[PDB]
Design a protein around this motif. Structure first.
Motif, PDB file in Angstrom:
ATOM      1  N   UNK A   1       0.851  -1.187   0.000  1.00  0.00           N
ATOM      2  CA  UNK A   1       0.000   0.000   0.000  1.00  0.00           C
ATOM      3  C   UNK A   1       0.886   1.236   0.000  1.00  0.00           C
ATOM      4  N   UNK A   2       1.549   1.541   1.119  1.00  0.00           N
ATOM      5  CA  UNK A   2       2.460   2.682   1.130  1.00  0.00           C
ATOM      6  C   UNK A   2       3.735   2.350   0.373  1.00  0.00           C
ATOM      7  N   UNK A   3       4.090   3.215  -0.569  1.00  0.00           N
ATOM      8  CA  UNK A   3       5.245   3.006  -1.427  1.00  0.00           C
ATOM      9  C   UNK A   3       6.034   4.301  -1.493  1.00  0.00           C
ATOM     10  N   UNK A   4       7.345   4.191  -1.294  1.00  0.00           N
ATOM     11  CA  UNK A   4       8.285   5.270  -1.552  1.00  0.00           C
ATOM     12  C   UNK A   4       8.936   5.027  -2.905  1.00  0.00           C
ATOM     13  N   UNK A   5       8.914   6.041  -3.769  1.00  0.00           N
ATOM     14  CA  UNK A   5       9.654   6.015  -5.020  1.00  0.00           C
ATOM     15  C   UNK A   5      10.754   7.059  -4.965  1.00  0.00           C
ATOM     16  N   UNK A   6      11.917   6.688  -5.479  1.00  0.00           N
ATOM     17  CA  UNK A   6      13.008   7.630  -5.651  1.00  0.00           C
ATOM     18  C   UNK A   6      12.882   8.434  -6.937  1.00  0.00           C
ATOM     19  N   UNK A   7      11.830   8.197  -7.724  1.00  0.00           N
ATOM     20  CA  UNK A   7      11.565   8.944  -8.956  1.00  0.00           C
ATOM     21  C   UNK A   7      12.750   8.906  -9.920  1.00  0.00           C
ATOM     22  N   UNK A   8      13.549   7.847  -9.866  1.00  0.00           N
ATOM     23  CA  UNK A   8      14.611   7.654 -10.841  1.00  0.00           C
ATOM     24  C   UNK A   8      14.182   6.738 -11.975  1.00  0.00           C
ATOM     25  N   UNK A   9      12.912   6.334 -11.988  1.00  0.00           N
ATOM     26  CA  UNK A   9      12.432   5.377 -12.978  1.00  0.00           C
ATOM     27  C   UNK A   9      12.528   5.917 -14.404  1.00  0.00           C
ATOM     28  N   UNK A  10      12.518   7.238 -14.580  1.00  0.00           N
ATOM     29  CA  UNK A  10      12.619   7.825 -15.910  1.00  0.00           C
ATOM     30  C   UNK A  10      13.987   8.432 -16.194  1.00  0.00           C
ATOM     31  N   UNK A  11      14.950   8.273 -15.293  1.00  0.00           N
ATOM     32  CA  UNK A  11      16.320   8.663 -15.590  1.00  0.00           C
ATOM     33  C   UNK A  11      17.004   7.556 -16.388  1.00  0.00           C
ATOM     34  N   UNK A  12      17.970   7.942 -17.221  1.00  0.00           N
ATOM     35  CA  UNK A  12      18.698   6.993 -18.060  1.00  0.00           C
ATOM     36  C   UNK A  12      20.103   6.802 -17.505  1.00  0.00           C
ATOM     37  N   UNK A  13      20.428   5.571 -17.130  1.00  0.00           N
ATOM     38  CA  UNK A  13      21.726   5.269 -16.560  1.00  0.00           C
ATOM     39  C   UNK A  13      22.433   4.174 -17.348  1.00  0.00           C
ATOM     40  N   UNK A  14      23.696   4.002 -16.989  1.00  0.00           N
ATOM     41  CA  UNK A  14      24.580   2.972 -17.514  1.00  0.00           C
ATOM     42  C   UNK A  14      25.364   2.400 -16.346  1.00  0.00           C
ATOM     43  N   UNK A  15      25.429   1.080 -16.249  1.00  0.00           N
ATOM     44  CA  UNK A  15      26.134   0.479 -15.128  1.00  0.00           C
ATOM     45  C   UNK A  15      27.638   0.469 -15.379  1.00  0.00           C
ATOM     46  N   UNK A  16      28.401   0.594 -14.295  1.00  0.00           N
ATOM     47  CA  UNK A  16      29.842   0.376 -14.368  1.00  0.00           C
ATOM     48  C   UNK A  16      30.327  -0.195 -13.042  1.00  0.00           C
ATOM     49  N   UNK A  17      31.428  -0.938 -13.104  1.00  0.00           N
ATOM     50  CA  UNK A  17      31.945  -1.642 -11.941  1.00  0.00           C
ATOM     51  C   UNK A  17      32.820  -0.716 -11.112  1.00  0.00           C
ATOM     52  N   UNK A  18      32.668  -0.803  -9.794  1.00  0.00           N
ATOM     53  CA  UNK A  18      33.398   0.066  -8.871  1.00  0.00           C
ATOM     54  C   UNK A  18      33.656  -0.788  -7.629  1.00  0.00           C
ATOM     55  N   UNK A  19      34.771  -1.505  -7.643  1.00  0.00           N
ATOM     56  CA  UNK A  19      35.014  -2.542  -6.652  1.00  0.00           C
ATOM     57  C   UNK A  19      35.632  -1.923  -5.406  1.00  0.00           C
ATOM     58  N   UNK A  20      34.914  -2.015  -4.293  1.00  0.00           N
ATOM     59  CA  UNK A  20      35.313  -1.357  -3.061  1.00  0.00           C
ATOM     60  C   UNK A  20      36.302  -2.218  -2.298  1.00  0.00           C
ATOM     61  N   UNK A  21      37.279  -1.559  -1.674  1.00  0.00           N
ATOM     62  CA  UNK A  21      38.203  -2.198  -0.738  1.00  0.00           C
ATOM     63  C   UNK A  21      37.713  -1.873   0.677  1.00  0.00           C
ATOM     64  N   UNK A  22      36.946  -2.805   1.241  1.00  0.00           N
ATOM     65  CA  UNK A  22      36.346  -2.728   2.572  1.00  0.00           C
ATOM     66  C   UNK A  22      37.367  -3.095   3.641  1.00  0.00           C
ATOM     67  N   UNK A  23      37.481  -2.353   4.728  1.00  0.00           N
ATOM     68  CA  UNK A  23      38.521  -2.662   5.715  1.00  0.00           C
ATOM     69  C   UNK A  23      38.198  -3.850   6.610  1.00  0.00           C
TER      70      UNK A  23
END
Ligand SMILES: [Ca+2]
Ligand SMILES: [Ca+2]
Lengths: 167, 167, 167, 167, 167, 167
Positions: free
Chosen positions: B1-23
Motif C-alpha cells: 500500500x504505502x510506497x516510496x519512489x526515488x523517482x529515478x524510474x525515468x532517468x537513463x543510466x549505464x552500469x559500471x563496476x566500482x570494486x570497493x576495498x572494505x577494511x
C-alpha cells in the motif's frame, strides 16, 4: 626517478561489489549554473515537484598541510591543493496504493569531497582507487571466514553506532 | 500500500563496476576517539611517519526541508533528519631512488556526507543505491554503444571542466 | 561475624508471576554511546521512524544518608553510595486495518533507579529481591481469600488514585 | 480496525521468572501523606528505628513529544501525557554477633517512572507488558540453548560494566 | 634503502625468563577516565576497600634531542616525539590469622615511561625489545658459568646497593 | 602471625613470555657517577658516537599515603617508603646501503619508577611479581580462546588508542 607510494600495501581489505548507476547526461541533464568554479546540472526528466540536481565544484587549497601534522622537513615545496565536491540532490515521494490523495515529498542530498595535493605523481587511477578505499568504509570486512565476506554498516552508523563491530 | 519512489524510474543510466576495498577493522584499525556522535579510528599498520585515519560522525538535522526548494506536505511524518559523515585521511609519501635525502609527505583526505530524512519507508538498501547513483557522477555514460561505455570525470573536474563533456 | 538484615521478615506479601522478556543483545542491539558512566544501546531491528533504545548509567552518591533521618550514631563509616539507572525508550505506532494512510507515532519511556549503599554485606541477590519487592507495589495483595490473590493498580495510579484500595 | 502495535514483534526475547512480592496493604501500610498527586505510605510492621515507606505520584506531561526524536503526526489525538512514579524506601540494619555495641543502618531506595501518552488504545495490559520488557534489561538472554538461559546484569552494571556482555 | 641499528649487536647479555600476567580487561576492568591524552581504568572486581587502577597516557615531545648529547649535525630532520606512561596502582592488605581486628592497607604504585622519536623506522618490535632490555636492568648477568645465570637486584637497589656486583 | 595479600588472587590474567636481555656489567659497562642516591653507568664498548647509558636512583618517600585514597584509620603505623628509578638511554643510528653519506642518530630513553613502602612483609619476590604485572599492561589478554593468547599494545597506545580493545 621519483616514486610515489600510497602506503596501503600493508592494509587488509576485502573486495566487494558496488555497481554504479552512471548518468547519461545528454539524455537527462541540462545545465543550471556554469560559473567558473561551480557547475549545477538539473534533471530534465522530473516533474515540477521533484527536484533532481547535481553540483560539481572546485576550490583551491592554500596550504595543503594547514591542518595536518606532517613535519616541515617533509613537506613538499608546492603546498597548493585542489578540493573537489560532487553533490547530488534528489526528491523522493511517498504515496499509497489504496489512497491516491496520500502523499508527501522527502528531500535527500549527499556529497563527496576530495582534497588532492597538486603533485605531478598523483594520477587519476590513484585517486579513483582512493575513492574506492573511501567508500569501502561503509562496510566491514571479514577475513575470518573461509571465503572473505563483508557486512553493511550504513544504518548502524546513522543510528549512532559509529565504532565498527569488528572493534 | 504505502510506497516510496526515488523517482529515478525515468532517468537513463549505464552500469559500471566500482570494486570497493572494505577494511578488516579487526586487523587494521583501533579507536582514537569514542565520543557519542564522533568516532575516530586509526590504522595500526602504518609506520610512525604515516598517518591513516577514518572518522565517522552524525549530526541531527532540525528541519530537512529548510534549505530545500521542497517544502513539507501536510501528511509528512516528521521534519527531522540525520546527517552522516564518513571521512578517510591518508598520508602518501614521495621518495627518490637516486637521493636518500629527498622525500616528502602528501596529505590526502576525502569524505562523504549523507542527509537522510526520518521516514521509516527509507530503507538501508534505498540509501546504498542512492550512494551508488551519487558515485556514478564521477563518470559519464553512453546509451549508444551496444555494450554501454563509461568514461571518467575525476581528472577533468579537478582540472576545472565541471560541466560533463556529454553536455 | 557481621550480619545484614533487610527487616522484611515481618512484612506480609503475596507472590505473583511477572515474566520478564529479556533482550538478546547480540541479535538486536548495537551501542550508541560508551561513556564511562553512561551507555546507550539502540535496537537495530527497528525501521527509521521507530526509535527503540536503552540507557544504563551510574552516578556516585556523596552522602547516602544525606536525605534520610538515620541518627548519626547509627550511620556506617562509609557513606558513599551508587545510583544505577536503567531506561528503556520505545516508539509505538497506531494505524488502521481499513485505512492504510491513517497512522501516528507515540513515544513511551520508563526507567528504574536503584540507590545502593557501598557495603560489603549487600549482595546481588539481596538487590534483585529488593527489585522484586519494588515492582510488587504495582499490585495489591489479598490474604483474605483462601488462595492468596493479587489485583492490578497501574491504571488506577495513573488516573490519580494513588492510595491502595486496601486502605 | 484501529490497532496499536508496540513494534516489538521483530525483537528477540527470552522469558525468565521474576516473582513479585505484592504488599498486603491492609495489614502493613498506613497513609502518611494523602495529597492529590502524591501519596506517601508507611510500613506499620517495622520497629521505631527502621523506616519503610512507599511513595506514589503522578505529574501531568505537557508535550510527550518534546524531548523525543519522535514528533507528532497530523492525526494524533493529543500531545498530553501522564508520568507515574513508584518509590520504595527501606532501612536495612547491620549488627554483630560478637559485639552488642556494633551496628549501623543502611538506607535503600529505588523507584520506577513510567511516561504514558494520552491515547485510549494504550491499555493497562500494554503498560504492564512494557514494564516486563523494562525489567528484562536487568538480564541478558540466549536464544542458543535449547532451554533458553538468562544471566544477570545488576552487579556488573552497578560495578560500571554498563554494556551488555553479549555485545 | 634506509636501515636503523640499535647498536646492541656487540653488547653482552644473558637471557632470563620474565612471564607477564596480562589483564583480561573485558572481565576485570572498567574505564574511569576517557580523555584524549589520558585514560584511567579500574578493577571493578576488587572489594570496595581495595582500589586496583591503571593509567595510560601520552604527552607529545617537542624536541626529542633536548636533554641529549647529540650535536645538531647528527640529528634527524624531525625532532617530534611521543612519551608514553603506563602506571599501575594496587592496594595490598595485611591481616592476622589469630586476630580478626588486626590489619592495614599498603599502597603500591609503579609506572613506566617510554620516550619514542617519531621515525618510521622505529618498529613496535624494536620498542618491545628495548623494554625487555630496560627490565633486564633489574637483574645482573653472569655468562662465565657453564649455564648463563642471573641474580635479582631489585631489593639490593631499594636497600642502597645501586652499583652492580660485577662493577 | 602476620600475612600480606596483594589481593590479585581473584583477578584474571593470561601469561605471556617476555625474555629479558640482562647486561654483563663486567664486560660492557663502567661507572660514570657514584653518588649515594644516584649511580650512572655507561657502555664503554659502544663507538664514540653512540652513547649507551643507564641510571639507578633512589629517593626516600616521606608519606607513602600522600596521593592515595586510603583513610588514616587503615594506614600502617609507618609512612616511610623508598622510590626506585631505573633509566636506560640508547642511541640508534640510521644509515643507507646505497649512500655512505646518509645517516642520523635517534635518541631512545625509557625508565621505570617503583614506589615501595618499607614494610618487612613486602618481599623481593612480591616486588618482581608486581613488576611482571606492570609490564603485562603493554599487552592485552584473551582467555576465551582455546589457547590463551595475547596481542601487543605498545604501538596502539603510542598512536592514541589508549583504551584496550576489550573495553
Ligand atoms: Ca567520552
Ligand atoms: Ca491535604
Amino acid at each position: 626517478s621519483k616514486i610515489l607510494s600510497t602506503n596501503n600495501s600493508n592494509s587488509n581489505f576485502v573486495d566487494t561489489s558496488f555497481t554504479l548507476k552512471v548518468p547519461v547526461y545528454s539524455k537527462d541533464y541540462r545545465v543550471t549554473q556554469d560559473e567558473p568554479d561551480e557547475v549545477v546540472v538539473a534533471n530534465r526528466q522530473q516533474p515540477f515537484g521533484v527536484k533532481n540536481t547535481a553540483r560539481y565544484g572546485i576550490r583551491q587549497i592554500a596550504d595543503v598541510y594547514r591542518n595536518t601534522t606532517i613535519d616541515r622537513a617533509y613537506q613538499s615545496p608546492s603546498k597548493k591543493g585542489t578540493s573537489l565536491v560532487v553533490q547530488v540532490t534528489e526528491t523522493w515521494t511517498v504515496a499509497s496504493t489504496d489512497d491516491e490523495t496520500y502523499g508527501y515529498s522527502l528531500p535527500f542530498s549527499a556529497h563527496v569531497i576530495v582534497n588532492v595535493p597538486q603533485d605531478a605523481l598523483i594520477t587519476e587511477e590513484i585517486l579513483y582507487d582512493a575513492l574506492k578505499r573511501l567508500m569501502g568504509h561503509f562496510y566491514e570486512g571479514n577475513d575470518t571466514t573461509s571465503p572473505t565476506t563483508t557486512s553493511v554498516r550504513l544504518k548502524d552508523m546513522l543510528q549512532g553506532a559509529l565504532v565498527p563491530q569488528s572493534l
